[PDB]
Amino acid sequence: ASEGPALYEDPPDQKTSPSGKPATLKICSWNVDGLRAWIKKKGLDWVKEEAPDILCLQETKCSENKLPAELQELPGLSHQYWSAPSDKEGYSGVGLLSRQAPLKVSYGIGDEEHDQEGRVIVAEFDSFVLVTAYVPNAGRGLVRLEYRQRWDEAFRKFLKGLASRKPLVLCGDLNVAHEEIDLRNPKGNKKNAGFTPQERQGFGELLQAVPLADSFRHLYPNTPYAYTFWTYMMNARSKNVGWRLDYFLLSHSLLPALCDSKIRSKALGSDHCPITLYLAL
């Protein structure tokens, strides 16, 4: 009610690193709010236009066994891996589609308690490991906040492990706006899923512990009104009343390779927009 439109125009794509090296890897990440729904909403059209080397998808709501045939229309992303809840139903779920086959693909974070909801894919490549995640939402009334805190600890420790062996890129819907600058209405959301002190603290712990850097915030430290999610309700997207819930987090050692971290504000298909990373590896 108290917010009108706040302008945001994502800057042009910077496709060369600070050292002049052209980007060699383009990763796109997107919470699609259901693979089938997203496809009907022309989601694949943007993907073909963006032409990433790797596409990471969250909330596919679909198992490896029940994918839409339409996914075959992505010839440039022929290596496709999917995680879904082990109960076999249509919620959560993540996907990773890649131009080249990873050295290894794994699912989950090595912890039975946290591996039943199809939330994580790990794709190891030559010079780095990519993790895509759909982090547990704290829930209406914060009924799942206790579990989210358990997830946060387990996930941090897991990622700390991976990074100790290879440079890490983490992307996806992390279900938290880190700082006040990461959402339009910080004041009235401090007791809502996505902006509780607990969740924000967990994110801070993640950055320090692994450690990881927030690619977007690193490049644009003072830039407000840059969001990746808007509730479907209340003309929230038209007014740019949103949250930045989608990230690329990078091992510090990968910062010199960082060209840009983009937010594709205008791409439709879901209640989130795509984000895109350019790396010079």
mmCIF file of C-alpha atoms in Angstrom:
data_model
loop_
_atom_site.group_PDB
_atom_site.id
_atom_site.type_symbol
_atom_site.label_atom_id
_atom_site.label_comp_id
_atom_site.label_asym_id
_atom_site.label_seq_id
_atom_site.Cartn_x
_atom_site.Cartn_y
_atom_site.Cartn_z
ATOM 1 C CA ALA A 1 0.000 0.000 0.000
ATOM 2 C CA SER A 2 2.782 2.417 0.952
ATOM 3 C CA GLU A 3 5.015 1.586 -2.015
ATOM 4 C CA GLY A 4 4.800 2.851 -5.575
ATOM 5 C CA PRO A 5 7.141 1.939 -8.448
ATOM 6 C CA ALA A 6 10.892 1.955 -7.797
ATOM 7 C CA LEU A 7 13.007 1.977 -10.955
ATOM 8 C CA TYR A 8 15.692 -0.585 -11.690
ATOM 9 C CA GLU A 9 17.578 -1.045 -14.930
ATOM 10 C CA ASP A 10 20.148 -3.821 -14.789
ATOM 11 C CA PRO A 11 23.432 -2.430 -16.232
ATOM 12 C CA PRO A 12 24.810 -3.714 -19.568
ATOM 13 C CA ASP A 13 26.517 -7.127 -19.582
ATOM 14 C CA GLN A 14 30.186 -6.793 -18.687
ATOM 15 C CA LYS A 15 31.644 -9.746 -20.597
ATOM 16 C CA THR A 16 35.315 -9.217 -19.739
ATOM 17 C CA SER A 17 36.997 -9.616 -16.349
ATOM 18 C CA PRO A 18 38.926 -6.877 -14.508
ATOM 19 C CA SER A 19 42.046 -8.286 -16.201
ATOM 20 C CA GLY A 20 40.603 -8.122 -19.719
ATOM 21 C CA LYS A 21 39.842 -11.824 -20.070
ATOM 22 C CA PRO A 22 36.621 -12.531 -22.004
ATOM 23 C CA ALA A 23 33.943 -14.517 -20.182
ATOM 24 C CA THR A 24 34.181 -18.206 -21.064
ATOM 25 C CA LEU A 25 31.243 -19.478 -19.021
ATOM 26 C CA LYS A 26 27.689 -18.175 -18.786
ATOM 27 C CA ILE A 27 25.464 -19.716 -16.109
ATOM 28 C CA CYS A 28 21.759 -18.891 -15.816
ATOM 29 C CA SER A 29 19.724 -19.724 -12.694
ATOM 30 C CA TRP A 30 15.926 -19.498 -12.384
ATOM 31 C CA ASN A 31 13.204 -20.521 -9.945
ATOM 32 C CA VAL A 32 10.590 -21.455 -12.526
ATOM 33 C CA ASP A 33 7.585 -22.084 -10.227
ATOM 34 C CA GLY A 34 6.838 -25.416 -11.893
ATOM 35 C CA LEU A 35 8.532 -26.673 -15.034
ATOM 36 C CA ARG A 36 5.234 -27.218 -16.853
ATOM 37 C CA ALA A 37 3.711 -23.886 -15.838
ATOM 38 C CA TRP A 38 6.936 -22.104 -16.764
ATOM 39 C CA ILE A 39 7.050 -23.783 -20.175
ATOM 40 C CA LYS A 40 3.465 -22.700 -20.925
ATOM 41 C CA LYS A 41 4.531 -19.178 -19.962
ATOM 42 C CA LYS A 42 7.192 -19.291 -22.680
ATOM 43 C CA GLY A 43 10.085 -19.777 -20.249
ATOM 44 C CA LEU A 44 12.132 -21.748 -22.778
ATOM 45 C CA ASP A 45 11.964 -18.796 -25.164
ATOM 46 C CA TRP A 46 14.123 -16.655 -22.881
ATOM 47 C CA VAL A 47 16.507 -19.554 -22.338
ATOM 48 C CA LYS A 48 17.095 -19.920 -26.072
ATOM 49 C CA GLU A 49 17.667 -16.149 -26.292
ATOM 50 C CA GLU A 50 20.046 -16.121 -23.312
ATOM 51 C CA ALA A 51 21.936 -19.183 -24.594
ATOM 52 C CA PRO A 52 23.790 -20.009 -21.367
ATOM 53 C CA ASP A 53 26.428 -22.758 -21.085
ATOM 54 C CA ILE A 54 24.700 -24.017 -17.954
ATOM 55 C CA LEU A 55 21.102 -23.597 -16.832
ATOM 56 C CA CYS A 56 20.124 -24.205 -13.204
ATOM 57 C CA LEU A 57 16.426 -24.491 -12.385
ATOM 58 C CA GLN A 58 14.579 -24.487 -9.040
ATOM 59 C CA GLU A 59 11.039 -25.576 -8.080
ATOM 60 C CA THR A 60 10.741 -27.769 -11.168
ATOM 61 C CA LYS A 61 8.016 -29.690 -9.298
ATOM 62 C CA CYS A 62 8.924 -32.615 -11.543
ATOM 63 C CA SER A 63 10.898 -35.863 -11.332
ATOM 64 C CA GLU A 64 13.511 -37.180 -13.747
ATOM 65 C CA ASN A 65 10.833 -39.716 -14.678
ATOM 66 C CA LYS A 66 8.081 -37.262 -15.549
ATOM 67 C CA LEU A 67 9.742 -34.400 -17.409
ATOM 68 C CA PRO A 68 7.996 -32.429 -20.174
ATOM 69 C CA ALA A 69 9.122 -33.473 -23.663
ATOM 70 C CA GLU A 70 9.580 -29.778 -24.417
ATOM 71 C CA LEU A 71 12.928 -29.874 -22.604
ATOM 72 C CA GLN A 72 14.366 -31.733 -25.592
ATOM 73 C CA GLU A 73 14.113 -28.474 -27.529
ATOM 74 C CA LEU A 74 17.280 -27.267 -25.805
ATOM 75 C CA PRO A 75 19.940 -28.830 -28.083
ATOM 76 C CA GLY A 76 22.702 -26.654 -26.632
ATOM 77 C CA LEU A 77 22.045 -28.021 -23.152
ATOM 78 C CA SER A 78 21.960 -31.749 -23.850
ATOM 79 C CA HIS A 79 23.342 -32.928 -20.509
ATOM 80 C CA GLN A 80 20.385 -32.701 -18.144
ATOM 81 C CA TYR A 81 20.191 -33.763 -14.491
ATOM 82 C CA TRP A 82 17.254 -33.594 -12.128
ATOM 83 C CA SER A 83 16.618 -33.974 -8.428
ATOM 84 C CA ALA A 84 13.123 -34.439 -7.014
ATOM 85 C CA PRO A 85 11.642 -35.274 -3.583
ATOM 86 C CA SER A 86 12.114 -38.969 -2.817
ATOM 87 C CA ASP A 87 8.388 -39.373 -2.105
ATOM 88 C CA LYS A 88 7.834 -38.789 -5.841
ATOM 89 C CA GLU A 89 5.369 -35.871 -5.620
ATOM 90 C CA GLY A 90 5.218 -32.525 -7.431
ATOM 91 C CA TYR A 91 6.924 -29.929 -5.262
ATOM 92 C CA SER A 92 10.416 -28.503 -4.855
ATOM 93 C CA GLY A 93 12.867 -30.057 -7.311
ATOM 94 C CA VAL A 94 15.955 -28.712 -9.072
ATOM 95 C CA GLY A 95 17.504 -29.158 -12.484
ATOM 96 C CA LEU A 96 20.880 -28.595 -14.065
ATOM 97 C CA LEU A 97 21.297 -28.535 -17.828
ATOM 98 C CA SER A 98 24.731 -28.177 -19.347
ATOM 99 C CA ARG A 99 26.424 -27.785 -22.723
ATOM 100 C CA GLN A 100 29.172 -30.151 -21.556
ATOM 101 C CA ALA A 101 28.912 -33.180 -19.270
ATOM 102 C CA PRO A 102 30.249 -32.574 -15.733
ATOM 103 C CA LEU A 103 33.017 -34.830 -14.391
ATOM 104 C CA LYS A 104 30.558 -35.979 -11.753
ATOM 105 C CA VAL A 105 26.989 -35.243 -10.750
ATOM 106 C CA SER A 106 25.697 -35.805 -7.230
ATOM 107 C CA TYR A 107 22.438 -35.059 -5.425
ATOM 108 C CA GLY A 108 21.889 -33.713 -1.932
ATOM 109 C CA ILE A 109 24.349 -32.660 0.744
ATOM 110 C CA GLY A 110 25.341 -36.032 2.181
ATOM 111 C CA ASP A 111 22.750 -35.892 4.956
ATOM 112 C CA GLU A 112 19.692 -38.167 4.948
ATOM 113 C CA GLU A 113 17.580 -35.689 6.930
ATOM 114 C CA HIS A 114 18.090 -32.933 4.352
ATOM 115 C CA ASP A 115 18.205 -35.032 1.161
ATOM 116 C CA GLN A 116 14.558 -36.100 0.819
ATOM 117 C CA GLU A 117 13.146 -32.999 -0.847
ATOM 118 C CA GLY A 118 15.071 -32.729 -4.125
ATOM 119 C CA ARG A 119 16.844 -29.489 -3.297
ATOM 120 C CA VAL A 120 20.469 -29.777 -4.424
ATOM 121 C CA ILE A 121 22.522 -30.814 -7.437
ATOM 122 C CA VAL A 122 26.320 -30.810 -7.372
ATOM 123 C CA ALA A 123 28.104 -30.706 -10.715
ATOM 124 C CA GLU A 124 31.878 -31.000 -10.665
ATOM 125 C CA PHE A 125 33.807 -29.590 -13.616
ATOM 126 C CA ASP A 126 37.506 -29.344 -14.434
ATOM 127 C CA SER A 127 38.336 -26.129 -12.588
ATOM 128 C CA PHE A 128 35.310 -25.597 -10.323
ATOM 129 C CA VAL A 129 32.296 -27.237 -8.705
ATOM 130 C CA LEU A 130 28.800 -25.869 -9.291
ATOM 131 C CA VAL A 131 26.057 -26.345 -6.749
ATOM 132 C CA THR A 132 22.495 -25.325 -7.434
ATOM 133 C CA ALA A 133 20.028 -25.207 -4.555
ATOM 134 C CA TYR A 134 16.411 -24.548 -3.644
ATOM 135 C CA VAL A 135 16.678 -23.708 0.061
ATOM 136 C CA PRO A 136 13.780 -24.652 2.402
ATOM 137 C CA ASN A 137 11.297 -21.797 2.845
ATOM 138 C CA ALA A 138 10.722 -20.858 6.506
ATOM 139 C CA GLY A 139 6.984 -21.235 5.910
ATOM 140 C CA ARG A 140 3.854 -19.253 6.728
ATOM 141 C CA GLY A 141 3.867 -18.486 10.445
ATOM 142 C CA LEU A 142 7.526 -19.508 10.386
ATOM 143 C CA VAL A 143 6.468 -23.086 11.133
ATOM 144 C CA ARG A 144 9.534 -24.369 9.287
ATOM 145 C CA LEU A 145 12.055 -21.868 10.650
ATOM 146 C CA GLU A 146 13.411 -24.372 13.153
ATOM 147 C CA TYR A 147 14.130 -26.795 10.327
ATOM 148 C CA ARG A 148 15.498 -24.043 8.071
ATOM 149 C CA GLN A 149 18.124 -23.325 10.728
ATOM 150 C CA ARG A 150 19.065 -27.004 10.793
ATOM 151 C CA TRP A 151 19.281 -26.971 6.993
ATOM 152 C CA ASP A 152 21.437 -23.844 7.022
ATOM 153 C CA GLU A 153 24.042 -25.394 9.299
ATOM 154 C CA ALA A 154 24.195 -28.682 7.397
ATOM 155 C CA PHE A 155 24.403 -26.906 4.029
ATOM 156 C CA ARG A 156 27.173 -24.565 5.178
ATOM 157 C CA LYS A 157 29.293 -27.427 6.465
ATOM 158 C CA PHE A 158 28.726 -29.363 3.235
ATOM 159 C CA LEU A 159 29.754 -26.409 1.054
ATOM 160 C CA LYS A 160 32.764 -25.692 3.240
ATOM 161 C CA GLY A 161 33.804 -29.243 2.413
ATOM 162 C CA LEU A 162 33.436 -28.885 -1.355
ATOM 163 C CA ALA A 163 35.289 -25.564 -1.419
ATOM 164 C CA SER A 164 38.222 -27.105 0.439
ATOM 165 C CA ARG A 165 38.849 -29.208 -2.675
ATOM 166 C CA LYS A 166 37.757 -27.060 -5.617
ATOM 167 C CA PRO A 167 36.627 -23.466 -6.251
ATOM 168 C CA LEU A 168 32.879 -23.314 -5.672
ATOM 169 C CA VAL A 169 29.994 -21.567 -7.416
ATOM 170 C CA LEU A 170 26.667 -21.765 -5.576
ATOM 171 C CA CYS A 171 23.562 -20.574 -7.322
ATOM 172 C CA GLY A 172 19.828 -20.715 -6.878
ATOM 173 C CA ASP A 173 16.939 -19.587 -4.739
ATOM 174 C CA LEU A 174 18.430 -19.270 -1.258
ATOM 175 C CA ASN A 175 15.147 -18.069 0.230
ATOM 176 C CA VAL A 176 16.570 -15.092 2.072
ATOM 177 C CA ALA A 177 17.141 -11.416 1.341
ATOM 178 C CA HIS A 178 20.496 -10.858 3.064
ATOM 179 C CA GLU A 179 20.418 -7.145 3.915
ATOM 180 C CA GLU A 180 17.763 -4.428 3.998
ATOM 181 C CA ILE A 181 18.924 -3.317 0.537
ATOM 182 C CA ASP A 182 17.855 -6.766 -0.738
ATOM 183 C CA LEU A 183 14.102 -6.181 -0.450
ATOM 184 C CA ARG A 184 11.656 -3.338 -0.972
ATOM 185 C CA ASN A 185 10.007 -3.497 2.451
ATOM 186 C CA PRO A 186 12.498 -4.571 5.151
ATOM 187 C CA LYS A 187 10.561 -3.061 8.075
ATOM 188 C CA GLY A 188 7.339 -5.035 7.679
ATOM 189 C CA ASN A 189 8.977 -8.332 6.772
ATOM 190 C CA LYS A 190 11.267 -8.960 9.756
ATOM 191 C CA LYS A 191 8.826 -11.608 10.996
ATOM 192 C CA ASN A 192 8.163 -13.116 7.573
ATOM 193 C CA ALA A 193 9.783 -16.035 5.784
ATOM 194 C CA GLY A 194 12.803 -14.723 3.865
ATOM 195 C CA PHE A 195 13.819 -11.845 6.130
ATOM 196 C CA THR A 196 13.896 -13.201 9.686
ATOM 197 C CA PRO A 197 17.030 -12.374 11.686
ATOM 198 C CA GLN A 198 17.711 -16.118 11.802
ATOM 199 C CA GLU A 199 17.736 -16.505 8.012
ATOM 200 C CA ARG A 200 19.773 -13.361 7.378
ATOM 201 C CA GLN A 201 22.260 -14.519 10.007
ATOM 202 C CA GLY A 202 22.551 -17.921 8.369
ATOM 203 C CA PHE A 203 23.407 -16.250 5.069
ATOM 204 C CA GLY A 204 26.060 -14.126 6.759
ATOM 205 C CA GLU A 205 27.534 -17.264 8.326
ATOM 206 C CA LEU A 206 27.631 -18.944 4.912
ATOM 207 C CA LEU A 207 29.614 -16.095 3.354
ATOM 208 C CA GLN A 208 32.190 -16.021 6.157
ATOM 209 C CA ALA A 209 32.518 -19.748 6.844
ATOM 210 C CA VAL A 210 33.152 -21.208 3.380
ATOM 211 C CA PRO A 211 33.977 -18.494 2.491
ATOM 212 C CA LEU A 212 31.810 -17.147 -0.317
ATOM 213 C CA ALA A 213 31.223 -13.735 -1.878
ATOM 214 C CA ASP A 214 27.851 -12.448 -3.097
ATOM 215 C CA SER A 215 28.686 -11.899 -6.774
ATOM 216 C CA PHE A 216 26.003 -9.281 -7.423
ATOM 217 C CA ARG A 217 26.536 -7.297 -4.216
ATOM 218 C CA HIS A 218 30.308 -7.484 -4.723
ATOM 219 C CA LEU A 219 30.003 -5.723 -8.083
ATOM 220 C CA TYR A 220 27.134 -3.402 -7.123
ATOM 221 C CA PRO A 221 27.617 -2.707 -3.384
ATOM 222 C CA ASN A 222 25.314 0.330 -3.184
ATOM 223 C CA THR A 223 22.662 -0.477 -5.790
ATOM 224 C CA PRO A 224 19.088 -0.599 -4.433
ATOM 225 C CA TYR A 225 15.798 -1.942 -5.845
ATOM 226 C CA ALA A 226 17.463 -4.920 -7.534
ATOM 227 C CA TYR A 227 15.235 -7.938 -6.888
ATOM 228 C CA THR A 228 14.662 -11.436 -8.288
ATOM 229 C CA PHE A 229 11.263 -12.286 -6.742
ATOM 230 C CA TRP A 230 7.917 -10.483 -6.526
ATOM 231 C CA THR A 231 4.793 -12.047 -5.049
ATOM 232 C CA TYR A 232 2.214 -12.851 -7.722
ATOM 233 C CA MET A 233 -0.260 -10.858 -5.639
ATOM 234 C CA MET A 234 -0.955 -7.140 -5.499
ATOM 235 C CA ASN A 235 0.722 -5.887 -8.684
ATOM 236 C CA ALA A 236 3.974 -6.392 -6.794
ATOM 237 C CA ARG A 237 6.150 -6.878 -9.880
ATOM 238 C CA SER A 238 4.753 -3.840 -11.717
ATOM 239 C CA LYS A 239 5.600 -1.720 -8.672
ATOM 240 C CA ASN A 240 8.968 -3.440 -8.163
ATOM 241 C CA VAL A 241 8.072 -4.424 -4.612
ATOM 242 C CA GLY A 242 10.344 -7.463 -4.504
ATOM 243 C CA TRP A 243 13.052 -9.472 -2.767
ATOM 244 C CA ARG A 244 16.497 -10.553 -3.909
ATOM 245 C CA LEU A 245 16.347 -14.273 -3.113
ATOM 246 C CA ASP A 246 18.398 -15.605 -5.995
ATOM 247 C CA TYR A 247 22.193 -15.518 -5.875
ATOM 248 C CA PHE A 248 25.490 -16.597 -7.332
ATOM 249 C CA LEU A 249 27.906 -17.052 -4.439
ATOM 250 C CA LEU A 250 31.594 -17.500 -5.357
ATOM 251 C CA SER A 251 34.733 -18.752 -3.662
ATOM 252 C CA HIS A 252 36.997 -15.753 -3.095
ATOM 253 C CA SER A 253 39.536 -17.344 -5.462
ATOM 254 C CA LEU A 254 37.045 -16.933 -8.318
ATOM 255 C CA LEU A 255 36.587 -13.173 -7.887
ATOM 256 C CA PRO A 256 39.341 -12.322 -10.380
ATOM 257 C CA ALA A 257 37.377 -14.429 -12.885
ATOM 258 C CA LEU A 258 34.127 -12.573 -12.229
ATOM 259 C CA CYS A 259 32.933 -10.504 -15.197
ATOM 260 C CA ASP A 260 29.341 -9.733 -14.251
ATOM 261 C CA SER A 261 26.351 -10.925 -12.269
ATOM 262 C CA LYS A 262 23.047 -10.049 -13.928
ATOM 263 C CA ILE A 263 19.377 -9.818 -12.978
ATOM 264 C CA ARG A 264 17.084 -10.352 -15.957
ATOM 265 C CA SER A 265 14.239 -8.253 -14.549
ATOM 266 C CA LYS A 266 11.963 -8.298 -17.595
ATOM 267 C CA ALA A 267 12.060 -12.033 -18.372
ATOM 268 C CA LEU A 268 8.632 -13.496 -17.635
ATOM 269 C CA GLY A 269 7.605 -17.056 -16.824
ATOM 270 C CA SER A 270 7.562 -17.228 -13.029
ATOM 271 C CA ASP A 271 7.351 -15.111 -9.857
ATOM 272 C CA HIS A 272 11.147 -15.004 -9.976
ATOM 273 C CA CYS A 273 13.278 -13.647 -12.798
ATOM 274 C CA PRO A 274 16.454 -15.331 -14.111
ATOM 275 C CA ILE A 275 19.900 -14.385 -12.907
ATOM 276 C CA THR A 276 23.015 -14.795 -15.015
ATOM 277 C CA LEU A 277 26.708 -15.148 -14.211
ATOM 278 C CA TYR A 278 29.603 -14.432 -16.557
ATOM 279 C CA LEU A 279 32.920 -16.008 -15.540
ATOM 280 C CA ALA A 280 36.303 -15.899 -17.252
ATOM 281 C CA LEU A 281 37.576 -19.382 -16.440
#
